[PDB]
Design a protein around this ligand. Structure first.
Ligand SMILES: COc1cccc(CNC(=O)c2nc3sccc3c(=O)[nH]2)c1
Ligand SMILES: [Ca+2]
Ligand SMILES: [Ca+2]
Ligand code: NA
Ligand SMILES: [Zn+2]
Ligand SMILES: [Zn+2]
Length: 168
């Protein structure tokens, strides 16, 4: 027999993602680099592996949309809600949606796509919000060079998946 696991988490270390569509605001290359870097934030401190799929069904389906886009969490035009992601599980579980009424960037202007993606993928992997105002998983977006994952987020993600190689 098997009872349900104690916490919501992926039951496998190999996860896939798919960039289903793209924002007008950035090049395909810029978007791909931002998401790759965002996944690496989490794979660096766990035993998780992320593989990109070009088509078909991936664990983490990524998309840009506006207003009603196929779930119970419609976006709201410019400002307000920015993005959301579902916790680990089947179907919409793990998926990450970005409001394409926001301005997405690879700079300090608008919303930095890498930074928001890194936060969203935290939710995709099973982290809820943190009370630490310096944490990646803090509820409110603020945005320097060279990103470093704060310790609160490292402890959180490692409570779910372990550290993987502690010196890779
Ligand atoms: C959609 O809600 C979101 C989206 C993204 C981030 C957040 C909250 N986290 C931050 O804003 C943040 N974390 C870190 S971790 C190292 C630097 C920084 C930084 O410059 N900002 C909330
Ligand atoms: Ca919005
Ligand atoms: Ca999914
Ligand atoms: Na946009
Ligand atoms: Zn959505
Ligand atoms: Zn959040």
């Amino acid at each position: 027999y098997n009872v349900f696991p104690r916490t919501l988490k992926w039951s496998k270390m190999n996860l896939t993602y798919r960039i289903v569509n793209y924002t007008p605001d950035m090049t395909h290359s810029e978007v791909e680099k931002a998401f790759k870097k965002a996944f690496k934030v989490w794979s660096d401190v766990t035993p998780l592996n992320f593989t990109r799929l070009h088509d078909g069904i991936a664990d983490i389906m990524i998309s840009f949309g506006i207003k009603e886009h196929g779930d119970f969490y419609p976006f709201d035009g410019p400002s307000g809600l920015l993005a959301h992601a579902f916790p680990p599980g089947p179907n919409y579980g793990g998926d990450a949606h970005f409001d394409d009424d926001e301005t997405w960037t690879s700079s300090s202007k608008g919303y930095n796509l890498f930074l928001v993606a890194a936060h969203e993928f935290g939710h995709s992997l099973g982290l809820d919000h943190s009370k630490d105002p310096g944490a990646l998983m803090f509820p409110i977006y603020t945005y320097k060079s060279h990103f470093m994952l704060p310790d609160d987020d490292v402890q959180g993600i490692q409570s779910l998946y372990g550290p993987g190689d502690e010196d890779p």
